[PDB]
Ligand SMILES: *[C@@H]1O[C@H](CO)[C@@H](O[C@@H]2O[C@H](CO)[C@@H](O)[C@H](O)[C@H]2NC(C)=O)[C@H](O)[C@H]1NC(C)=O
Ligand SMILES: *[C@@H]1O[C@H](CO)[C@@H](O[C@@H]2O[C@H](CO)[C@@H](O)[C@H](O)[C@H]2NC(C)=O)[C@H](O)[C@H]1NC(C)=O
Ligand SMILES: *[C@@H]1O[C@H](CO)[C@@H](O[C@@H]2O[C@H](CO)[C@@H](O)[C@H](O)[C@H]2NC(C)=O)[C@H](O)[C@H]1NC(C)=O
């Protein structure tokens with residue numbers, strides 16, 4: 001009936017911000033080679049204040065060279081003694097975010113680690129000081145090379161924590177003059193971190209924030225008892241259709257209401273990875289065609305705006321928040337300066353299901369809600385109104401101002417289903433707008449890369465999405481014809497997060513492709529035992545990369561070749577001998593059409609009319625038999641969709 005908003009009895013918890021994750025894994029892969037001005041426009045929709053999603057927080061993966069959901073991300077230390085703070089795209093993204101919003105909150109979290117840190121085991125806790133040292137170098141590098149202050153550091157994404165590690169990480173941060181950096185744990189479930197904090201005072205002293213993943217809007221008693229800030233440090237992960245925006249809208253409010261969580265962070269920031277990769281299109285917006293410049297400002301962007309444009313880290317939640325009689329919820333926040341923001345959501349069950357978890361049915365129906373401002377809020381006489389309707393339009397439309405002149409801190413609204421209203425004293429709200437970007441277009445049916453870039457802006461060539469291993473621009477001054485190549489640089493399996501393949505692989509192109517010819521120059525660096533391949537119709541990647549099928553044309557340094565149906569190499573289409581050795585450049589061609597494939601070695605036919613599964617479709621790919629050095633050059637693909 002009448003919902004009282006008041007601050008006279010005091011305030012609730014401090015609001016810590018809304019944000020999103022770039023990483024886990026390679027989710028921003030295809031954004032770096034967007035042409036201007038579109039790349040810049042995309043970044044504005046995400047980070048420019050009073051414009052789009054206007055994010056308060058940016059969380060990035062600390063790349064460890066392993067596969068972490070939609071690809072691998074490069075580490076700053078591939079090997080022992082190696083340090084490089086210019087690989088990948090997270091440095092860039094953080095800087096671009098920081099340019100638009102100097103106050104954005106930066107977080108880093110490892111998913112995987114380079115293998116050498118395990119010292120012969122696939123475990124990051126073998127040498128506590130070493131792993132901490134590795135992580136802190138990243139934070140230092142961020143500052144020294146990019147002028148970035150990392151605000152929060154996590155432990156190991158959705159993987160066990162070690163209490164002694166967390167303590168050592170804190171000590172190592174302090175030793176390096178990073179007392180200001182805070183620690184969030186354990187980016188998994190509420191337990192065992194929450195009870196551990198209650199039993200171990202020294203642990204309690206070093207953990208600043210408890211971050212839980214996909215909590216279903218609820219926390220647990222031990223976490224509340226701890227007095228720590230509680231965050232949904234990873235949520236959403238739903239297709240950014242209308243249902244995802246609904247999901248997002250609902251949890252943004254109810255994470256605080258039901259669970260005392262004062263921050264929520266969406267996986268992921270922007271869908272800039274092939275859609276046929278795991279969890280495709282589960283970013284706040286979509287930017288998966290750098291070749292065309294086409295992007296989509298999806299519904300979740302505006303749902304975010306309803307909170308982010310009208311709140312900032314350091315505002316406080318009111319004590320008076322809750323559910324509406326006929327379903328839906330409201331929160332309210334102030335900045336202790338006379339501003340008030342109110343965010344109301346009526347997401348229906350049928351249009352707001354998140355993937356994790358799925359909620360039992362609940363009812364929303366037409367209702368009236370009366371709001372009364374008590375205490376220090378009585379003096380508000382005017383509120384701006386922002387409105388969104390999900391289902392088929394209207395997104396973030398500014399409605400007519402409401403007046404509260406009646407002397408009665410009150411007003412009423414007619415609420416229907418699947419709506420959002422924001423009511424705030426702030427006048428800075430804006431539905432940012434750029435002209436529409438180019439229409440959607442398939443990946444180019446003819447495509448070439450000779451990797452001849454002397455000072456590349458990024459460490460890897462556009463569109464190649466590593467799914468196991470790490471491929472990088474490589475300069476070899478001692479060769480002329482192959483001065484500039486692409487190289488696989490991992491020489492041992494990472495401390496994996498996912499089940500990485502046993503073979504390295506990078507995929508590219510149009511998953512819809514069915515008939516195609518792929519050609520590449522290859523160079524095996526490891527004598528006797530080394531091997532490389534080129535492939536087409538590759539149908540799975542990311543977390544599922546081990547499961548990839550397609551047509552794989554392998555050559556080996558022992559003078560042999562194989563054609564397989566799978567990356568694992570368990571199913572043979574053909575095999576034989578070849579004039580092939582290490583440390584020599586060969587041109588490989590693989591032609592797939594209908595039921596049949598053929599392979600060429602240096603323009604000469606090696607095998608032909610070999611029967612392959614059909615129908616089938618997928619990407620082109622390159623890679624190596626194990627985690628081994630190899631080079632690639634003059635890549636070309638002609639394909640039919
Ligand atoms: C956690 O949030 C809950 C709300 O979910 C807060 O508890 C409410 O407290 C009021 C009175 O203080 C009760 O009338 C409500 O019934 C409580 N809510 C529920 C759902 O039972 C609580 O203050 C928060 N815990 C903290 C801040 O430690
Ligand atoms: C609401 O918030 C705005 C923005 O923070 C406040 O306006 C600022 O007030 C400070 C001092 O209180 C000034 O130094 C800034 O220049 C102001 N900025 C802007 C953009 O106006 C405002 O005081 C708050 N209260 C109300 C009633 O608007
Ligand atoms: C890929 O190649 C196959 C094999 O040639 C094509 O299938 C043929 O298509 C023609 C006309 O479209 C038919 O007359 C043949 O009977 C088909 N043969 C088989 C075995 O299916 C297929 O159309 C090609 N697809 C693309 C997208 O180019």
Ligand SMILES: *[C@@H]1O[C@H](CO)[C@@H](O)[C@H](O)[C@H]1NC(C)=O
Pocket residue numbers: 363364365
């Ligand atoms: C939802 O509530 C309305 C009124 O309370 C009722 O008429 C309707 O049948 C309910 N829907 C379900 C599925 O229970």
Ligand SMILES: OC[C@@H]1[C@H](O)[C@H](O)[C@@H]2CC[C@H]1N2
Pocket residue numbers: 023024025068069158213234237267279
């Ligand atoms: O919903 C899938 C999410 C992403 O894949 C992130 O990488 C982590 C791992 C699972 C979940 N959080």
Ligand SMILES: [Ca+2]
Pocket residue numbers: 450451452481482483484485633634
């Ligand atoms: Ca070259």
